[PDB]
From a paper:
Human spermine oxidase (hSMOX) plays a central role in polyamine catabolism. The second pathway involves a one-step reaction where Spm is directly oxidized by hSMOX to produce Spd, H2O2 and 3-AP. Due to its association with several pathological processes, including inflammation and cancer, hSMOX has garnered interest as a possible therapeutic target. The monomeric enzyme consists of two domains (the FAD containing F-domain and the substrate-binding S-domain) with the non-covalently bound prosthetic FAD group in an elongated conformation at the interface between the domains.
The co-crystal structure of hSMOX with JNJ-1289 was determined at 2.1 Å resolution, revealing that JNJ-1289 binds to an allosteric site, providing JNJ-1289 with a high degree of selectivity towards hSMOX. To understand the binding of JNJ-1289 to ehSMOX, the inhibitor was soaked into crystals of ehSMOX and diffraction to anisotropic resolution cutoffs of 2.98, 2.98, and 2.04 Å was collected. JNJ-1289 binds ehSMOX in an allosteric pocket ~13 Å from the FAD isoalloxazine ring. Critically, one of the loops near the active site entrance (aa 190–210), which was not resolved in the first ehSMOX structure, is now well defined and is bent in front of the substrate-binding pocket above JNJ-1289, indicating stabilization of the loop upon inhibitor binding. The electron density for JNJ-1289 allows unambiguous placement in an allosteric pocket nestled between the protein surface of the ‘open’ structure and the previously unresolved aa190–210 loop closing on top. The JNJ-1289 phenol oxygen is involved in a H-bond with the carboxylic acid of Glu207. The central thiazole is involved in several π-stacking interactions with residues Val184 (H-π), Tyr181 (T-shaped π) and Trp205 (π-π). The imidazopyridine ring of the inhibitor forms a H-bond with the carboxylic acid of Glu185, while the pyridine ring makes an edge-to-face interaction with the side chain of Tyr127. The loop position in the JNJ-1289 bound-ehSMOX confers a U-shaped substrate-binding cavity that is more similar to the zmPAOX than to the mPAOX structure. As observed in the JNJ-1289-ehSMOX co-crystal structure, the compound-induced conformation of aa190–210 closes off the putative active site.
Author numbering:
A (entry chain A), B (entry chain A): 3 to 80, 98 to 134, 140 to 249, 254 to 490
Write the structure that this text describes.
């Protein structure tokens, strides 16, 4: 028949791998997808004539980005100030916000010269914040009331950083000569029609029989003495294979590696799985009848005055809501309506995922009332939100550079099992583009290219 | 190697099968048992120097019973009146109980002449009760107060019958010339040391490596084009086999047959699985500090005066307790202490299994107070009870003759799949001894004898 290839997962990596193989005339290819849908951590949701992204939101980069090339080639591409509010209703002055912002940028840049690896990243933030904290307290020409606001903004800024995959994702943005945090102009693009359109363009080539939806794998049996690999599905089907490409998230690997592989994985790969970090990042959309936020406001930034002294990382499960750093006003209102877009990251995101919509909605409304100083804000007409952490096909949003891991661990995760029987793909297997759509895509093409090369050589031999 | 034989389950049928094969020099035998223990629906529990049975309690029969032969050969074998109480505390007179008992026995025997199959069984009870109900109401020489008691005892007697596997299990007992329900003398024997001792005597022959405890099967793959059978365990191990003997309960088959077999079972077997009935029967033990029941009382029989008109079968989930027909006083007190032994059968048993011990205990204590007329009865020191229905390795206590099934369905369940690739054992596969320990044992020996015969012939051929 030619090589039997099972691709596990139909996110960007799985589809990229399958397309690349089929493009090379690989006849005997099957994709097994656990969920009812393709796209994985690309999940687009339509409400009215407007799309909301629950997963991947922006295309990072331009020329060279193969997902930018897709979006651009099929024509899928194309205000105010941020409003800092205290938990006692009062708004923080332009001056105070600008002063803090300037101090932080000065210290963060001076510090990043001082200290490019995963452990050394952490040190920048830790010592930045200590140095910023010292200068605020030490500044003799500041009233004590204002010092307590600025010190609380350290905790606010820390919540903003929490959602980032690296320091390098936070090295895109720099501070403007007029106190605003300006991103590089052509860096981040949205797809108004939805990010799923890219998934569908990628899947277009692939025949319909290849992709098996609602078909999760239970175990990969490799090193067999017919196919020397056997894929065991949850519905108990035994699929013989020559090669397998695993694209499931690092979070799936962390929870299932002991059962998922027979025999067990080599111990350096198991160590890599443990050492590498995957974070839970969820999106919360709050659609209101009309805007209670001022027209100058791009966003509503939450500075809790009682967090001046805290060096907190994780909140208790009652204070999960305190992990939200603020809400962005979606523009334009005509496309999206009056919708606030929020992010929550880490253990507090898993706590949010357990709550019902009416509960999450209520707590966000309570927050917004307290911060705005208007207690009359109605409950939002609609709410939309993700649950990547508790979903057993994801168990996380994206891989990040954890203190006590390295680029060495990604190479170890990405390394194939002997005879290329089992190949490792997915965002977390990409050395430099991990936690992105293009990393996911390129990782799929890498493992495909590996089998492609193996059988160009068995044509060049034979 | 000689034939690879996987036996699924290490209850009486699985052990009987494995022993019989090994006795015949079958080298390559494995038993896979889901639970941590052997014995299955034989489960013995020690408290003090005394054993309580949660499953199989009595050896039914003597000479010819191969479980009697075991018990007898290893030397493991060797009061008052039943007290009928109303839910308003008052005790029902000797006369009233004897009169009812005589009427019922007369009608039940006259009726059983009128109508030996599974559907025709049901008709006996239905018309017995209607005829008994008529004569009570019709009797001109009875006060109305007494008629309402006797009519409630129909519902009581119906609860007693509910726990029986057949009419033939209720054809052992007959009525004495002095109004008592007398069992045949040498019919039922207990094992004071515990029923598990029989399980252990049966397992004695078998080497330790053969039985894999804590090892449930997920799927049997048969009809494979190495072993033409593959047993798929829950921990994802693939065990190649030539023959498999399935001994799991009818309840396990009802819930799992669609996933458990690949390809699917022949449709007459699937029909047999649906047609055959398995009931949930649980035991409740209530150990008290001292006896509040009178010394004349073998048992405390519960007659609810408000059930005179009802033709109930299933109670709602709040009235689950009403399915208990009474409690037996265990004899002798020196062995067991002051322990009441109760039975609950059907859907109401599953409702009991969901409740906590403190809850079940409380409701039984409440019942006992109301019926005795003593509200001062303390909460029992200990409680012990079974959960056969909710246990996923049982999902029932024993197979019964359901209206709309026949002996034909048992033959259909018991029939092996082609090439004797998969063999069907267990109590519910025995034509006449279903719902017994000896039926279970003999069913195991039958499937063993089948493979034994197959390979005496492949020795006589070769
Ligand atoms: C002013 C002001 C302030 C504004 N601040 C701006 C800061 C913004 C910084 N950028 C942030 C971007 C985020 C957060 N973005 C973001 C947000 C959020 C909420 C998420 C969740 C992610 C992202 N990323 C990451 C990507 O989405 C992710 O890497 C890829 O989709 C993964 O593809 P894959 O490897 O194939 O895995 P998959 O999991 O997709 O596929 C594997 C499949 O396997 C299946 N499966 C599982 N188990 C199985 C089994 N047992 N058997 C069979 N199948 C099985 C499973 O169902 C899947 O379909 C982003 N990327 C990007 O490019 N742009 C972005 O903006 C974001
Ligand atoms: C005065 C006055 C009034 C007094 N009234 C007197 C009336 C009394 C009438 N007699 C009543 C008797 C009862 C109720 N008795 C009674 C009471 C109660 C509460 C019960 C629960 C039963 C009974 N019976 C029935 C037997 O116990 C039963 O038939 C056998 O144990 C079954 O053996 P097996 O077929 O091998 O199955 P198993 O299930 O045991 O074995 C299969 C194994 O498979 C395992 N398994 C499941 N799934 C698996 C997977 N996926 N992979 C691997 N393994 C898996 C599983 O864990 C098991 O170990 C009795 N029999 C008897 O002889 N005397 C009796 O007294 C009673
Ligand atoms: O694409 C972006 C990203 C961020 C922002 N805006 C804000 N950034 C920060 C912030 C926190 N920590 C640091 C460290 C370095 C630089 C910025 N920051 C606070 S608000 C706008 C556009
Ligand atoms: O091994 C036994 C079984 C039962 C009893 N005692 C009682 N049996 C009945 C009863 C109900 N229905 C019928 C129909 C026919 C015969 C009896 N019964 C009520 S109390 C004692 C020993
Ligand atoms: Cl969006
Ligand atoms: Cl007992």
């Amino acid at each position: 028949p030619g090589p039997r290839v099972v691709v596990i997962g139909a996110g960007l990596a799985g589809l990229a791998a399958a397309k690349a193989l089929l493009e090379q005339g690989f006849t005997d290819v099957t994709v097994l997808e656990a969920s009812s849908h393709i796209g994985g951590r690309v999940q687009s949701v339509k409400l009215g004539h407007a799309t909301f992204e629950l997963g991947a939101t922006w295309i990072h980069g331009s020329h060279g980005n193969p997902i930018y090339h897709l979006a651009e080639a099929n024509g899928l591409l194309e205000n105010g100030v941020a409003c800092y509010l205290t938990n006692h209703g009062r708004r923080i002055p332009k001056d105070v916000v600008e002063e803090f912002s300037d101090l932080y940028n000065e210290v963060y840049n001076l510090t990043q010269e001082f200290f490019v690896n995963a452990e050394s990243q952490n040190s920048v933030g830790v010592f930045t914040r200590e140095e910023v904290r010292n200068r605020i307290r030490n500044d003799p020409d500041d009233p004590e009331a204002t010092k307590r606001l600025k010190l609380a903004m350290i905790q606010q800024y820390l919540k903003v950083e929490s959602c980032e995959s690296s320091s390098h994702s936070m090295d895109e943005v720099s501070l403007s000569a007029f106190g605003e945090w300006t991103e590089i102009p052509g860096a981040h693009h949205i797809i108004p029609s939805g990010f799923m359109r890219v998934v569908e363009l990628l899947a277009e080539g692939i025949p319909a029989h290849v992709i098996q939806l609602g078909k999760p794998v239970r175990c990969i049996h490799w090193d067999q003495a017919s196919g020397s690999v056997v894929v065991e599905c949850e519905d108990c089907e035994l699929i013989p294979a020559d090669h397998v490409i695993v694209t499931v998230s690092l979070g799936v690997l962390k929870r299932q590696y002991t059962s998922f592989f027979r025999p067990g994985l080599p111990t350096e790969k198991v160590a890599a799985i443990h050492r590498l970090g995957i974070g839970t990042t969820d999106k919360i959309f709050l659609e209101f009848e009309e805007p209670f936020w001022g027209p100058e406001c791009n966003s509503l930034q939450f500075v809790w005055e009682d967090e001046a002294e805290s060096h907190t990382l994780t909140y208790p499960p009652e204070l999960w809501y305190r992990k939200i750093c603020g809400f962005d006003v979606l523009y334009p209102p005509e496309r999206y309506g009056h919708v606030l877009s929020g992010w929550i990251c880490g253990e507090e995101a898993l706590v949010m995922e357990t709550l019902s919509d009416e509960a999450v909605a209520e707590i966000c409304t309570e927050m917004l009332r307290q911060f705005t100083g208007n207690p009359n804000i109605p409950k939002p007409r609609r709410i939309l939100r993700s649950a990547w952490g508790s979903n057993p096909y994801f168990r996380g949003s994206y891989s990040y550079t954890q203190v006590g891991s390295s680029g060495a661990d990604v190479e170890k995760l990405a390394k194939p099992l002997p005879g290329l029987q089992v190949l490792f793909s997915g965002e977390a297997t990409h050395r430099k583009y991990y936690s992105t759509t293009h990393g996911a895509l390129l990782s799929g093409q890498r493992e495909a290219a590996r089998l492609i090369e193996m059988y160009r050589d068995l044509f060049q031999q034979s």
